[PDB]
Design brief:
It is found in: Cell membrane. It comes from Homo sapiens (Human). The structure is a monomer. This protein has two domains: 85 residues, Phosphorylase Kinase, domain 1, CATH 3.30.200.20; 176 residues, Transferase(Phosphotransferase), domain 1 (Orthogonal Bundle), CATH 1.10.510.10. It is built from eight helices and seven strands. The protein has a five-stranded antiparallel β-sheet with strand order 1-2-3-5-4, with helices on one face. The chain has a two-stranded antiparallel ribbon with strand order 6-7. Helix 3 packs antiparallel against helix 5, helix 3 runs antiparallel to helix 8 and helix 5 runs antiparallel to helix 7. The chain is globular and about 55 Å long. Bound molecules: the ligand CS(=O)(=O)c1cccc(Nc2nccc(Nc3cccc4[nH]ncc34)n2)c1 and magnesium ion (2 copies). The site of one magnesium ion has 3 residues, from loops.
């Protein structure tokens, strides 16, 4: 979806990505109402192609828990990726600002949205590789959407150790099952209102700890069923981890039986 650059007004810089700035803007194209957009702006030709691979793959997705591509600008500089705008930004920082201010049911709803997005990606054979609360964006109604897409390999970025399943660290075998590990980490982040996973450990400490059977403890006030689901995501045997359809189904059952959520350590 090449977009005429005259249709785009950039309004403010709102963040930084791995290739450049993130801005808020407005897109108005003939036939369509004006919408608010987020804009990544961009190097070698390989880096340009890596940058744009995000748009290539995002444009192929359509799901309420996956950020929607509006278009790209490639015929002028800077080159741009334009998406729907998520007013509340990254989930880890949104939760820190809102520490202790959402109910367990609301937090489960967020996790259910993220798990539905992942179920869709897994169904499309897309392995995310960087599933982390920082890559979940949150709109005005607490709707959570998966972001940070691309087809580049890590050295691309560096493997995100704290979020990465042990077999993906050791052997670089990334699968939807290693994403399920990362999802368990995201659950822990959400229930801890955006605490850093393993905050008191270095990357190497995390690698060594997981190998020696350490798992993150239940966050304060975290329902035991939610922590058990984390522990299930963090099974060493990747084939024993629940798949995303089972994850969504587990969360939906908790939402049906909220009394279950009152059991805490
Ligand atoms: C208003 S605020 O200061 O709370 C704020 C800060 C940062 C981001 C957003 N929303 C926000 N909403 C949508 C997208 C986005 N960043 C991106 C733009 C283009 C491609 C992308 N891939 N992955 C992410 C991404 N960011 C909002
Ligand atoms: Mg990534
Ligand atoms: Mg990333």
């Amino acid at each position: 979806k090449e977009i005429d650059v005259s249709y785009v007004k950039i309004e403010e810089v709102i963040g930084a990505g791995e290739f450049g700035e993130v801005c808020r803007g407005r897109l108005k194209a003939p036939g369509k109402k004006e919408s608010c957009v987020a804009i990544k702006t961009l190097y070698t030709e390989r880096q340009r192609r890596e940058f744009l691979s995000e748009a290539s793959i995002m444009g192929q997705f359509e799901h309420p828990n996956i950020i929607r591509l509006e278009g790209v600008v490639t015929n002028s500089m800077p080159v741009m990726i334009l998406t729907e705008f998520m007013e509340n930004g990254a989930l880890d920082s949104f939760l820190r600002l809102n520490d202790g201010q959402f109910t367990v049911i609301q937090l489960v709803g967020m996790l259910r949205g993220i798990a539905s997005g992942m179920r869709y990606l897994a169904e499309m054979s897309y392995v995310h590789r960087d599933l982390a609360a920082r890559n979940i964006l949150v709109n005005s109604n607490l709707v959570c959407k998966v972001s940070d897409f691309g087809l580049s390999r890590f050295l691309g970025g560096k493997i995100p150790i704290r979020w990465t399943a042990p077999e993906a660290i050791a052997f670089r075998k990334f699968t939807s099952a290693s994403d399920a590990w990362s999802y368990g980490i995201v659950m822990w982040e959400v229930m801890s209102f955006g605490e850093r996973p393993y905050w008191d450990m270095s990357n190497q400490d995390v690698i060594n700890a997981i190998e020696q059977d350490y798992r993150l403890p239940p966050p304060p006030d975290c329902p035991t069923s939610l922590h058990q689901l984390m522990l299930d995501c963090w099974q060493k045997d990747r084939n024993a981890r629940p798949r995303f359809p089972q994850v969504v189904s587990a969360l939906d059952k908790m939402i049906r039986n909220p009394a279950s959520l009152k059991i805490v350590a």
